[PDB]
Amino acid sequence: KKAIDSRIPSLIRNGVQTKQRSIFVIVGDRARNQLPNLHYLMMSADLKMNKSVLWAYKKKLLGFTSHRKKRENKIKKEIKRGTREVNEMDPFESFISNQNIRYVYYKESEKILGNTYGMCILQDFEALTPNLLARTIETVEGGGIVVILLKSMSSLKQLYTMTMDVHARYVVARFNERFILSLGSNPNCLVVDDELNVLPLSGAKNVKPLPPDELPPKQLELQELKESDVQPAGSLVSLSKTVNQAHAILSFIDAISEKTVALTAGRGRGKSAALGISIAAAVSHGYSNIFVTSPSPENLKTLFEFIFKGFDALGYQEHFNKAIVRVDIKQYIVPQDHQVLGQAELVVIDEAAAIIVKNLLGPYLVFMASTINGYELSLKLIQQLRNQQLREISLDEPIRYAPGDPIEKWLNKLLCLDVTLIKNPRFATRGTPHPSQCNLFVVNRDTLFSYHPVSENFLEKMMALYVSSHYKNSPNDLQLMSDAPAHKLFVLLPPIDPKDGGRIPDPLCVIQIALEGEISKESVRNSLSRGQRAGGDLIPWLISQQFQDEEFASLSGARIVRIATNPEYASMGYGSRAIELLRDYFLLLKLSEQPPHYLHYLGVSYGLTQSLHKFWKNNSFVPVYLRQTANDLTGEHTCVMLNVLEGRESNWLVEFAKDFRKRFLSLLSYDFHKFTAVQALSVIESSKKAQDLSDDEKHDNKELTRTHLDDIFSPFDLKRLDSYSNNLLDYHVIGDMIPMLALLYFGDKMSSVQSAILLAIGLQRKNIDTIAKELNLPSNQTIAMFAKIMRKMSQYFRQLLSQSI
Amino acid sequence: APMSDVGGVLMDKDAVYIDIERGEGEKLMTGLQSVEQSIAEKFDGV
């Protein structure tokens, strides 16, 4: 027996006194056997406490098996041997055989997103993805201990990096080093030996706080005031959280009970139970609401809302993947996808989930629009809310499982969930001088991710740039942008020569999907038996199947983003891309200048993205060749995925031009099955492919015109007779549908077309009928544009007839 | 059973009485425990 320390029990005492989570990091081998003692201390600090405990691991438990019949018969045959007596258990065996432990792999961390735990035991340290960190430290509640065990390689990294700034020596990872430094900065975290000594490198001093909640008392006061009918029953069933959440539920109830249409959109963070408030308001809406409601979540992702709906219904008055069917006993509600229920929107109330903005504008038109805006884009959705609908949208961000937590602050700081849209420039007109200058500098990512204060403030600015209104990336993407071997960045922020300060005008992350460098990194990582870092090369290596692209290295754009001010920000992004093309063609400090004049031996430079209109316009100012796409509907936005790749190298122009030619040849046929998107964007894509072909080719891929007997075989003679019947008569479907496929094929092959005639050629390629495509695009002079299309068909038929026959 | 040692954790008034890279941990607990007090910045003159 020995007294341990004056700080490690007192930390749990004041952590449960202030209802704040706390972090222990244990080193050494005999470290599993001190989680009994920390769990006992966590319970005896306050009995009125959750008891469950997580054991997130990655591949294998430390010294046990988590199967109680298995270890029971193992200890039975241990009894039968006789090295251990009958009524004997060491405290770790007793801990795992009596406590309530939930076991998860590091891969399936998404299965425990909702429940609550008193303790979390992170077993392995060397692999810790930040999405898993954000999912476990969120579910640990206010009297909570998160413990993290270590390994001898991490002990070497600790003894190295605990002096000033040194690192470990062999893909190298710096996210775990940033983690170690953040835990050195945290006040509610410390590092303990396996013998319960203290390493005071992480929050050394800690006093026992004095023995003893106004916002909670104001919550109880306003709740009891609302109590003194079924509205108070719903309010008391909902308000398991802050008075902010209670006031939000009460205000949404008041504005959406009898007022039938308002557009209320409650916005909140990952805490505070937004889905809980929605599901707890669902029962009150079913009471004083219409017989049908419309939910717009993801399919089979409405766990908290459906649980709170069933819970509040059972509170008041009740009784291919999963069951989300509608039930009633004395009501209807369906969790549907995008608005195929346009004619099935007789429900007067629809509640949507967080951000698909055009699909949201499609679905939210003619009913009471409740909406849940999770932070986990928001500015543009609030702008679209104010641009149309008595919008009473208001919500707040007080936490649910705490009142405020330094563990939540350190988690947000390390995982970089904090953002700031302040300007902090020299001037906007002087940043327009940077847009004329097109000057860019490299990141120096090792010194960037080494956690120093001003470096971390600029890195938070860089993370706000790299995820500012992006395409819904995540913290694991931040860990890939930090700790991958094939990565670089560029911050083309300031042109000025002032003192310490600046901004971020444009971040752009490259990915060296190479041949030489990627082959070196892959042959390295095959010893570690993993690796997947070649996407843009491997897409074309199966779609177009070119040994030239198998031999040529490539840079691929992971992401690139600018400010959200104005079209000058897109000009700044274009200047950043042009500066990056010039950069490819022509401890440590947290920037680089001479290395911005340095590069590798890369052949191709490509950006892979979704088929967006402004992204296509950026790809055209980029003019990088609009290469082979994929029309499989990626269910996030339904957007098709195109990887536009320039060739900026010595001798690759014929290869890239032939690839663009093959993509152009495939796109006209693949616009029949699963590409029915637009007319102007389709013309822009065809023009981009032909522009790539004209820029790359000199006379190599120069196609010959429509030959005589081949053109005679492609049409029929009576088909051309019907074409002349359309020339001097009506252009009906008895002669304008059998030949229209060959007409559109030869028209997009090879002698000019108008805007209306180009939309007619694209309309016959998309094979829709007359009153659909032209009336959607031009919306003016329908029969006159049909006659202009017939005249262009007559000119094409007269040209083909007078050419061949 | 508080006031007693369920397992090893014997609870006194305020103190807790428990019982039971090698040289690296032993040295970092012997001398270099609070030696990293003024080792935070490493010339981080922000």
Next chain:
RNA sequence: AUACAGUGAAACUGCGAAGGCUCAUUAAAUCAGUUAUCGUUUAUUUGAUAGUUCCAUGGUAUAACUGUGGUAA
């Protein structure tokens, strides 16, 4: 004791357990003796009981064992 050589965890092997409780009421049909089976089965016990040969040694395929692993088990 430079193809085996004693201790021997865990594996194949020979055998071990070689005969233990409750519940609904069958009148020489349950039972006991006896006659017979050239009318029949039989490990073990015991006594007996085998006559065809044209122009120096026969084949891969599995363990135990190693090695790579999956699964809460």
Next chain:
RNA sequence: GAUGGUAGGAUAGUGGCCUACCAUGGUUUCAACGGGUAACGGGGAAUAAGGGUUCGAUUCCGGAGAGGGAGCCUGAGAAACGGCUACCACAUCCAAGGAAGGCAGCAGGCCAAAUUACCCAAUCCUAAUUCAGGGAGGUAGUGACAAUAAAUAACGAUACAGGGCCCAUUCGGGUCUUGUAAUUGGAAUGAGUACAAUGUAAAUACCUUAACGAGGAACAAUUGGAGGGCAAGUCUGGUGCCAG
């Protein structure tokens, strides 16, 4: 299928044991067939005991069952206490993906809830064996129903008293070595404490047995009954000092 015949099937083989065909048989008042229990009782089923005369030794009540019927498998021997398949219910783990066995069992209880320890030494049984074993089997312990024979004293000396006992309604009568916290003396041993050896696989116990072990022999047996007597005491009654 009742009774038999002929042939085949199946059998370890005999066999209406089963099937085709055929004949209309067969048992019975010389007790067919059917009726029940002190069929938790009986029949020799068996040992008998030197006086218990239907208590008094045992094999077997009938057949089943391993949650419930069904089907299959193994073996010299089986429709297996130890196997599999499917159906139906119980039922535990579970990370909800799946892996199972049977414990829906046996012991107990309704002011004696502890038997579940040691051995094959004996008798048999199996056994490759001059060896191994058997919860077959034996041994021991807690768990009183005052049922059973013993003890809690035996023998002397001295002193000092004069009264003790019995009958009877009464008066009274009859009788005689009888008493005493009196002193005192040396002998006896038993409960207990214990050497052992014997016994026994071993240990307990019985048996045999050296050493110590009594004066309040305090090494301290009860239970119930009959009757008094006492205070500067207390209470009640009322024709002093009394009665209760």
